[PDB]
Structure 1
Amino acid sequence: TSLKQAYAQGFLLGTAVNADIVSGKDAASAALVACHFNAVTAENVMKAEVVAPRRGVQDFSAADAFVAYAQRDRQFVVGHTLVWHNQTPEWFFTTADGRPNTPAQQLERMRAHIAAVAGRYTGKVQAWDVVNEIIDEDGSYRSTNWVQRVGDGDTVVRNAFAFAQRYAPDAQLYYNDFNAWRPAKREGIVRMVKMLQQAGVRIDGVGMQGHWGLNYPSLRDIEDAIDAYAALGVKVMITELDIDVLPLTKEGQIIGTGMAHKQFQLPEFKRFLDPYRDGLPADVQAQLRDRYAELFALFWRKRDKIARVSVWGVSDDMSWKNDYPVPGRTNYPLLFDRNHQPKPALDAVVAVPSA
């Protein structure tokens, strides 16, 4: 009957929560969270640009509210995220005098931030996304702000997990990335985890972001990924699951701000890229059902290798996929609709465990 109850024997079944769920303002959603989920990940309020926006300033207010909220409702608290190239202010990568950070100054900035964030929520937050999205599509390290300023991809990852181990020794430490099903990217993640383990550094599991669609990815890629990770003696998790149903975006995951271009808001593109403003049609609503069904059928079959599955939101209006990568669209990615009612996709998902 309930998502967390039906999947109780398999894995934790969680969701992302925004400020409005945590504040109580979104009453309808917060009610669904307590009913259906046993893990919460703070959508945004734990990122570095909210936590330490400028030099000399801190803001833990919203994150403190999130942690307290989860404990109150008995949730498996997941912090997200400690070290990430996006949503991290310019001052993290420069000295007070404007100079780009030396390898030592960059790691000190990493150490201090982890100690500030993870060290604050010891015993309260159970799991940390330590490094988020550092591997490229070819499997190598991404030339990101962190990687450039430190100077070595292996060094960035290795230190972040060691700092998290020091300042939150109680907490599980996860690597989290998108397109973790891609063979070339997968082999890179394995490589990185294997260097962490032989270094003696702690890492509890790899999180597959699961930001997928109707026509991607293949179950082969997903299964082969879950296998490849579990074989390294670490947990596997689907951490931010949603199913994009709109044109173009259902075909593959898009990054960057190219789709945010002014030109795609023009009528001819508006009328193609956002075709479901009046509502989701019977057949596409059925597709979304079948797609969720086959994926959870996979997760439940592989239940021994998966510690947690989380949807990146409760109701469709909450979703980041309405305004990303194309602002102003009406997407239908999650398991509950805009009236907070169950979607025919949910009924299938709850059926999977007993099926």
Structure 2
Amino acid sequence: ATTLKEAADGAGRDFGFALDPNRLSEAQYKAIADSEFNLVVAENAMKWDATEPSQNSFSFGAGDRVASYAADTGKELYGHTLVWHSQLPDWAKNLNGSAFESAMVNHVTKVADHFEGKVASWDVVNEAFADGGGRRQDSAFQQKLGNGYIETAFRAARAADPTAKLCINDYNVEGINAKSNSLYDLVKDFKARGVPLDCVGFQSHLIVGQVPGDFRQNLQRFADLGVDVRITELDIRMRTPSDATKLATQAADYKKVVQACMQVTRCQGVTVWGITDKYSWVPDVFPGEGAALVWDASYAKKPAYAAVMEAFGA
């Protein structure tokens, strides 16, 4: 292989990226998107704020643009995300009880129906758990609906889309810890009772030099529950500006993550959360941090590029 797409294709695995469809008009961005990935996810275009800005009024143009991009380029389409506490519109926050449950169900149903037969997998529920174990403590869904909302969401998604792979997704669940144990318990429970659930997403927003050593073992125990696994939002952030040492450690870190996936038969692949450092979410959330992606802000390949190629087997 000479490209990351070629390495992943050759390995029989997915290598995806988070797309902002507005950046498609930047030709260098499009060139890399077209040639370097075999899967695409909408970074923002399929979230609740982006799809249902007022109650039962849907805006699918941006998500459709991502879907059409996937179909036109022959890439697998991954859906993100039906239920997530973050950036939920105020109209939804203002609802309670059965009115809120109904809005959630209607959102799942309408969005899943709209993209049916295009989106191959959904993050049905995103970030349900708390660092340190148990349920997230700042979620409208948890607060208004309690424990059962996850099962409700998965069943509604299956009702709408009989075949799509239905995933639950989270961060800080890459190692074996209280948070991933809570997640593991739910997955095992869902599979034991026949709640629709096919996959688990490991966001893998990691810090340079700190890839969990038990990542493979964790991915494997999940796969062994009878579900697929995926690295969904990989980036590996460092203190800026980058230097040779940090770039080398970052490359080694990318290799470790991709290798952990390669080493688990039901790991579908790895999706990186963007193309270029120019557009990464990291600097705005974490001041003084960044340079987390495979291409720098001028779209030059970083040492992480070779490391990803090598890990997929090339």
- TM-score bracket, shorter-length normalisation: over 0.9
Q: Which protein has the bigger strand share?
A: 2
| 1:79 equivalenced with 2:79 (yes/no) | yes
Name the counterpart of 1:340.
299
RMSD of aligned C-alpha atoms? 1.7
- Per-residue displacement from partner, 1:146-196 (whole Å, max 9, x unpaired)? 01111x22x111010000001122311110000112411111011111222
Q: Is the 8 A contact 1:181 1:224 kept in 2?
A: no
Q: Tell me if 1:132 matches 2:126.
A: yes
- Post-superposition Cα deviations, 1:85-123, rounded to whole Å, max 9, x if no partner, equal 00111221334xxxxx11x32221111111211111111
Deviation at 1:334, TM superposition (A): 0.6
SS in 1 for 2:285: coil
**2:260 alignment partner AA:** L
The aligned residue for residue 37 of structure 1 is 37
Corresponding residue of 1:235: 228
The structural deviation recorded for 1:10 is 4.4
**Using the alignment, how far apart are the partners of 1:69 and 1:160 within structure 2?**
27
Do residues 214 (structure 1) and 215 (structure 2) align?
A: no
TM-score when normalising by structure 2: 0.93
1:119 partner SS: helix
Looking at structure 1, the residues matched to 195 and 313 of structure 2 have their Cα atoms a distance apart, in angstroms, of 39
- Retained in 1: the 8 A contact 2:208–2:249? yes
Structure 1 residue 73: Cα displacement:
0.8
Partner of 1:300: 262
The structural deviation recorded for 1:295 is 2.6
More moved, 139-148 vs 4-13:
4-13
CA shift at 1:298, angstroms?
2.6
Aligned equivalent of 2:143: 148
Partner residue in 2 for 1:266: none
**1:267 aligned partner:** none
Code of the aligned partner of 1:284: K
1:188 corresponds to: 182
Residue 294 of structure 1 and its aligned partner are, at CA, apart by 2.7
Aligned AA (1:156): Y
Letter in 2 for 1:202: P
The equivalent residue for 1:173 is 166
Is residue 2:218 matched to residue 1:225?
yes
Residue of structure 2 in register with 1:256 after alignment: none
The match for 1:11 among 1, 10, 13 is: 13
1:10 and 1:300 in contact (8 A); partners too: no
- In 1: Cα distance, 2:255 partner to 2:191 partner: 35
DSSP 3-state at the match of 2:117: coil
Structure 2 counterpart of 1:261 = none
Return the alpha-carbon distance in structure 2 between the equivalents of residues 283 and 190 of structure 1. 36
Kindly indicate whether the alpha-carbon contact (under 8 Å) linking 1:219 and 1:295 is maintained by their aligned counterparts in 2: no
Q: Tell me the secondary structure at the aligned position of residue 142 of structure 1.
A: coil
CA contact (8 A) 1:15 1:311 kept: yes
Report if aligned partners of 2:223, 2:229 keep a CA contact under 8 Å in 1. yes
Q: CA deviation at 1:315?
A: 1.2
Distance 1:217 1:91 in 2: 39
- The question of whether the paired residues in 1 share the 8 Å contact of 2:216 and 2:263 is answered with no
Q: Distance between the aligned counterparts of 1:242 and 1:56, measured in 2?
A: 34
2:308 aligned partner, one-letter code: V
1:321 corresponds to 2:254? no
Deviation track 1:197-233 (CA, whole Å, cap 9, x = no partner) reads 233221111000010011324222x123102211101
Could you report, residue by residue, the CA deviation over 1:47-81 in whole angstroms, capped at 9, with x for unpaired residues? 11121122353211111111111111111111110
Mapped partners of 2:55, 2:100: distance in 1: 14
Aligned residues: 310
AA paired with 2:85?
H
Q: Distance in 1 between matches of 2:171 and 2:100?
A: 25
Contact residue 209 and residue 241 of structure 1 kept, 8 A: yes
Q: Give the direction of change, closer, same or farther, for the CA distance of 1:56–1:107 in structure 2 (3 Å limit).
A: closer
Structure 1: tracts of 5 or more residues without a match: 96-100, 247-274
SS at match of 1:136: coil
Spell out, residue by residue over 1:215-272, the C-alpha distance to the aligned partner (whole angstroms, 9 max, x if none): 324222x1231022111010110000000011xxxxxxxxxxxxxxxxxxxxxxxxxx
* Structure label with greater radius of gyration: 1
Verify: 1:107 aligned to 2:101, yes or no: yes
Q: Distance in 1 between matches of 2:109 and 2:79?
A: 14
Q: Which moved more, 1:292-301 or 1:343-352?
A: 292-301
Q: What amino acid maps onto 2:89 in structure 1?
A: P
**In the TM superposition, what whole-angstrom CA distance separates every residue of 1:311-335 from its partner, at most 9, and x where no partner exists?**
1111111211121233xx5621111
Contact 2:41/2:80, CA 8 A, preserved across alignment? yes
Secondary structure of 1:113's aligned partner: helix
Given residue 122 of structure 1, which amino acid in structure 2 is its aligned partner? Answer: E
CA 186–16 in structure 1, closer or farther in 2 if over 3 Å, else same:
same
